Design a protein around this ligand. Sequence first.
Ligand SMILES: OCC1CCN(c2ncccn2)CC1
Length: 171
Amino acid sequence: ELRVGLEESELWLRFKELTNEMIVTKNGRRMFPVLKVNVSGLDPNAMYSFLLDFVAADNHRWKYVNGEWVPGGKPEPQAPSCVYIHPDSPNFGAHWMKAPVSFSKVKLTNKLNGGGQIMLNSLHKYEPRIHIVRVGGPQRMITSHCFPETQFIAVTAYQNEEITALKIKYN
Ligand SMILES: OCC1CCN(c2ncccn2)CC1
């Protein structure tokens, strides 16, 4: 059975319990913490690409009001994010299972941009998700996994200084 797990879930949980925030810029900002996934149960000899996208966790605009995050009252449908291809893709099961798959080069933007960058809506809450795509072989297959622990709000600057401090303490 294909097992997918979160490396350093203990650090992600420190961020989650304060409500995590991720900076988004015109040119795109890398994530801290970095999403790292432990994968076991692949065919060492089979071929896979690792994809990353962000699901809008709810249909609301959020705002930092008197030191607390609160959702707007007027939901809109959230068009899903674009997919980031892990640069080691495509690659052998063995490649993927030898060390945690780390998405350190994905950059989060707020502007439609050349590409590589993933555009998110500022002040929307997002749940990171991966697709492990079996490629090259005859029987194409996809396995998807969400990481609730890694939820954040996309912000142009940090609102909760407790987040600012955790980010600096552990980078
Ligand atoms: O058929 C598989 C899909 C096609 C695109 N993919 C890709 N592209 C470039 C490098 C690594 N992977 C993976 C998803």
